[PDB]
Amino acid sequence: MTEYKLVVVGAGGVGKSALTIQLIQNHFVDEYDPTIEDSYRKQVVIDGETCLLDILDTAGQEEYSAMRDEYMRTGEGFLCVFAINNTKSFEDIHQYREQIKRVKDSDDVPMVLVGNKCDLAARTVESRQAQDLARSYGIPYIETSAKTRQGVEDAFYTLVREIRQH
Numbered sequence: 277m278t279e280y281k282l283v284v285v286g287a288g289g290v291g292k293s294a295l296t297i298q299l300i301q302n303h304f305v306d307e308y309d310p311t312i313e314d315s316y317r318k319q320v321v322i323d324g325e326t327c328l329l330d331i332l333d334t335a336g337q338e339e340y341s342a343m344r345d346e347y348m349r350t351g352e353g354f355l356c357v358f359a360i361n362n363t364k365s366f367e368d369i370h371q372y373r374e375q376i377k378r379v380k381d382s383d384d385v386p387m388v389l390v391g392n393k394c395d396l397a398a399r400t401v402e403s404r405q406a407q408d409l410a411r412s413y414g415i416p417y418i419e420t421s422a423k424t425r426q427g428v429e430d431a432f433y434t435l436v437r438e439i440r441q442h
């Protein structure tokens with residue numbers, strides 16, 4: 277069957293792991309344990325296709341990011357995650373996208389922009405600002421909450437749909 281290799285990237289603490297674990301394991305991780313490099317694999321049916329998701333959950337903390345580029349280079353699509361209550365994480369997205377372009381050696385890489393923690397009201401990134409960023413990259417913007425599950429399946433499945441367009 278088809279395997280989709282997804283890679284989740286973004287600044288430390290934005291909820292990359294919590295999103296991936298909510299998708300795969302159906303619970304919310306409340307604590308913050310910084311990631312080095314973890315992988316998850318699950319067979320799912322997406323738009324009627326039985327396929328295998330292979331998801332790489334990467335480090336956002338600089339200290340734990342050694343060799344992240346070597347993990348990223350295998351990816352077929354990238355979830356570029358920021359938190360809607362973390363303006364710096366949103367600003368960081370451009371540098372993650374530049375890194376993606378470098379590791380894939382391409383200006384045309386399947387990606388989705390994800391604004392996580394949308395259950396929180398300390399919003400400093402308005403939807404329209406992120407919509408505009410995503411538009412400049414030619415990709416969709418989706419908001420998620422790893423805590424409530426809002427948008428979680430949609431974000432990952434949208435990334436699969438973006439890979440299918442390439």
Ligand SMILES: Nc1nc2c(ncn2[C@@H]2O[C@H](COP(=O)(O)OP(=O)(O)NP(=O)(O)O)[C@@H](O)[C@H]2O)c(=O)[nH]1
Nearest residue numbers: 288289290291292293294306310311336393421422
């Ligand atoms: N309210 C709320 N908290 C969230 C959400 N997603 C993650 N968090 C919280 O934010 C913290 C960091 O989440 P985590 O998934 O570890 O972040 P990360 O991006 O994987 N960090 P790292 O890059 O260091 O591995 C945790 O305390 C987690 O519970 C969300 O959607 N809503």
Ligand SMILES: [Ca+2]
Nearest residue numbers: 279280281352
């Ligand atoms: Ca594949």
Ligand SMILES: [Ca+2]
Nearest residue numbers: 303304305306
């Ligand atoms: Ca929990």
Ligand SMILES: [Ca+2]
Nearest residue numbers: 378379380381
């Ligand atoms: Ca390269």
Ligand SMILES: [Mg+2]
Nearest residue numbers: 292293310311
């Ligand atoms: Mg993590």
Ligand SMILES: [Mg+2]
Nearest residue numbers: 400401402405
């Ligand atoms: Mg503002």
Ligand SMILES: [Mg+2]
Nearest residue numbers: 415416437438
């Ligand atoms: Mg699209």
